[PDB]
């Protein structure tokens with residue numbers, strides 16, 4: 334239980350940890366593709382990153398993370414709005430090789446998208462403390478000095494409150510849950526020893542991969 | 545909401561978090577197919593079951609639930625044995641129509657297996673008080689008096705200990721986490737009003753669909 338919710342400063346928030354609901358592709362329609370990362374996959378983005386080594390390449394997906402503050406079931410956008418508790422950044426770490434086998438087989442994705450620590454996550458910035466428009470926020474990821482992902486929240490197909498509203502249709506989001514909103518173009522592979530710095534609207538963190 | 549309890553109904557000192565399950569597992573075998581149901585899918589099977597009515601067919605899958613009592617990670621089969629804390633029955637509720645779609649489109653299964661209350665669960669029988677063989681236990685599910693599923697965990701391909709050993713290779717299992725083995729054949733629909741009675745070797749339980 335290493336991971337726990339906290340603001341940017343590092344102080345703990347009064348929200349449990351539980352699940353992370355994620356969107357398939359959401360950057361440039363057909364209903365949003367949905368999958369879920371378990372509590373086990375959550376981890377501090379500020380500490381070294383632990384990646385599997387015997388399952389094939391591991392890709393990085395920088396994404397905007399929305400922290401739910403109250404329960405949403407078959408919710409309306411007004412409810413979503415009032416409920417989101419903050420924003421931060423995450424890496425929708427995924428085992429591409431494994432996923433390909435899964436897709437071709439029409440099989441669950443948990444092996445490729447839900448393995449341990451497959452969701453490093455930054456601290457959160459309180460909803461009414463977030464300077465700027467979440468729907469128009471900058472997302473970037475650089476690996477060893479080279480920027481590999483750059484985009485803005487405005488390029489999302491399904492916006493933030495609509496997507497969350499849609500998600501609640503299949504799974505009730507309780508407070509403490511996190512929502513990954515998709516990744517921009519530029520998804521790449523991660524390797525032991527790489528140093529990577531993630532960034533979203535004026536905020537940055539730099540960590541490294543172990544092996 | 546749901547909380548872990550023993551058959552009698554008393555509360556167990558284990559948290560609730562996830563449910564790692566096998567896809568198909570009854571009859572050099574391809575390895576176990578693995579998906580997971582979130583805490584919000586867990587519900588009390590002694591109570592009337594709630595199913596979605598705007599997403600197509602809703603099927604039942606009777607299964608043997610194994611309650612993990614300690615952290616398992618890249619664990620051996622000995623860690624597994626000394627780690628399971630009990631057994632119970634569960635209904636691996638699934639949206640066949642949605643699952644069929646998901647399969648043909650190579651997309652995740654969450655929508656068809658992780659929806660709310662998609663996992664009715666019975667109380668657990670402490671591993672010590674379990675008089676019988678987990679690996680050779682009966683499972684039956686009756687809907688409105690007619691026999692739907694009638695099997696034995698002996699036909700379970702990936703045995704309970706190896707499977708869980710396997711599962712811990714991808715996601716560590718924590719105390720309170722539950723894993724569903726698999727279901728014999730006989731899987732069918734459940735509509736509102738059905739009277740459902742599920743059985744797991746020597747223990748019976750009945751309930752219905754709202």
Ligand SMILES: [Mg+2]
Nearest residue numbers: 356357394425
């Ligand atoms: Mg993604």
Ligand SMILES: [Mg+2]
Nearest residue numbers: 566567636726
């Ligand atoms: Mg199953």
